[PDB]
Amino acid sequence: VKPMLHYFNGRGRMEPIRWLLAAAGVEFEETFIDTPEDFEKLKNDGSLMFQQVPMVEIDGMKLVQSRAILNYVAAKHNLYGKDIKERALIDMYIEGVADLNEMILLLPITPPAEKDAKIMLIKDRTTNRYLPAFEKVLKSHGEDYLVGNRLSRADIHLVELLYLVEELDPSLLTNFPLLKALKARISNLPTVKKFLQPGGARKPPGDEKSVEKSRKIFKF
Amino acid sequence: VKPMLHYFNGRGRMEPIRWLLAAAGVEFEETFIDTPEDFEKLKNDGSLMFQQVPMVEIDGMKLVQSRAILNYVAAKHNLYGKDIKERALIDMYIEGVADLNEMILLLPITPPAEKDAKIMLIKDRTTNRYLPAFEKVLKSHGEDYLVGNRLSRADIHLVELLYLVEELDPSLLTNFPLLKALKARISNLPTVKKFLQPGGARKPPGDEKSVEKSRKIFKF
Ligand SMILES: N[C@@H](CCC(=O)N[C@@H](CS)C(=O)NCC(=O)O)C(=O)O
Ligand SMILES: N[C@@H](CCC(=O)N[C@@H](CS)C(=O)NCC(=O)O)C(=O)O
Incomplete structure (x- = not known):
């Protein structure tokens, strides 16, 4: 079954995990955090060990910490x-x-x-x-x-x-x-080419109204 | 031959590498950066890939980046x-x-x-x-x-x-x-006990005159 990526609809700290899973030719899905109530559901679910995202559901774990997720993907997929x-x-x-x-x-x-x-x-x-x-x-x-x-x-x-x-x-x-x-x-590379082409999971760069959206959800 | 740790005489980012090498029961030596000219010699030697410390000489590499050094020690020594x-x-x-x-x-x-x-x-x-x-x-x-x-x-x-x-x-x-x-x-644990006992490589906490010393050498 495909890994599930939990983050904001944006690059932030999840973007390198998108690139790496794309480069490995691993199909993934994303559940976007659109509101404060979405973030609060992940926390109250006990899904986030440190009350933070990124979070990736893969091989029966709820992995948080960008580097832990990357390390596990790179090692599993020979990178x-x-x-x-x-x-x-x-x-x-x-x-x-x-x-x-x-x-x-x-x-x-x-x-x-x-x-x-x-x-x-x-x-x-x-x-x-x-x-x-x-x-x-x-x-x-x-x-x-x-x-x-x-x-x-x-x-x-x-x-x-x-x-x-x-x-x-x-x-x-x-x-x-x-x-x-x-x-x-x-x-x-065929996998990365699809990732960068139209319809790829690669996220656009922020704008001033997009950073505003993320600053009220995580409030940092 | 023993790994060689290059850093300031203080905890900073080298302290977790001291703990981990100590816990693994690996004897190490340290070359302290006492002056600006000491830091400048490491850079002009081409020893620092990113012009920064920590730097550890181990198994014929000049490894920089705290996490790269830790990852390599933990894996080599079954931790x-x-x-x-x-x-x-x-x-x-x-x-x-x-x-x-x-x-x-x-x-x-x-x-x-x-x-x-x-x-x-x-x-x-x-x-x-x-x-x-x-x-x-x-x-x-x-x-x-x-x-x-x-x-x-x-x-x-x-x-x-x-x-x-x-x-x-x-x-x-x-x-x-x-x-x-x-x-x-x-x-x-016998290795960590020696590390924490008098004469151990464990570094004391900073004082206001010690942070001053580090702020003129690296100037941050
Ligand atoms: N060290 C973590 C950082 C995670 C992090 O800072 N996440 C932010 C969003 S980018 C967050 O969830 N903030 C909410 C909070 O800390 O309460 C990693 O690399 O995954
Ligand atoms: N990400 C590096 C950070 C290294 C770092 O920031 N080193 C500082 C001293 S703690 C330094 O060498 N500063 C000098 C400079 O950046 O010019 C690591 O984890 O090893």
Whole structure:
């Protein structure tokens, strides 16, 4: 039976789980949290170990914590490397992706007075810290994939971040030719291609009225 | 050969790696970052994939990202559950530990005007969200360990957080008798006992002059 994704109708912290399950060719369904009363039903059901989402129902568990869900999907569907040494590289790479993701993820709820400086810090970190590091990985081995010459979650998570970087400012990708080639190849895996095509589960970026909706339901 | 831990002489993000390696009975050494020039040497050496610490040299890798290092230690030393289903529970539990840890970890750099409210939010989340959740896990199975009736990193990470909670306010543990019993049993594993005893690698809590030292080296 298909996993069931419980979240808001939006990217938030569920978006990387959509990408990873899509890349694994796993068909899923979503129950959207449309109102406060929807969130309150999940809590009063005892479905949420920490009273939070994302929550995914898979293989008879109600899994919360984005990283717990991702770790379980990657391992079940052979996207977590061949051995614990490849896993160490994959984790080091995707934890770097996660830190830059987090800065972009919190932009919409940044006091608008400190938003410019926060956008400058993101552009600086993208061009001077993260993307040069992943570019050097691809430069060092010349293979099509970040780890083990084989598709992993690291490729999937990095390519999702490269799309977010391009949405923020396309010039940020200009000096990273190997990352652009990675983004083109991963986008063309049959599973990911359907995910990005019209009718795919890929969520649109927020607007100011969409962040408003999420700020009254979770109230953060 | 023993792993080499690169960090500041303090808890920060390296403290859970000290606990986990100690619990596994793995002897380690530390190279402390005492000055800006120490941090600059690690960066200019190309040792830090993302120009950050923690960094651990283990089995011929220079691993950065706290979670990558932890994941690799837990898996190598049999503290990550017997199967990917136990791993899903362990990850869900320790990601909840990580969120409450993070709130306590950022207290020292909280604008003092918003610190009281942030301390209230931590006490509220500790007593109403996190500790009731882990108490219920122990209540549901009556076993000595959180997962699989066997020592895992989940026990180690939760017991480190229970000590941090007790340092902040000992009354927070009052209504959690099973968590107190867990803390007493895990504290008495021979490896963890040496870690907590005088001469152990366990780091003291910060003071106002210690956070000052770290704020000029990393400048955050
Ligand atoms: N560390 C968690 C974070 C979960 C989280 O922050 N969820 C938010 C929505 S994005 C939430 O449920 N907020 C409601 C609350 O905390 O009361 C994860 O990675 O899954
Ligand atoms: N997500 C990383 C965070 C690493 C981190 O924030 N390190 C800080 C010190 S605690 C640092 O090196 N700051 C220097 C900088 O970012 O320039 C992890 O979990 O290891």
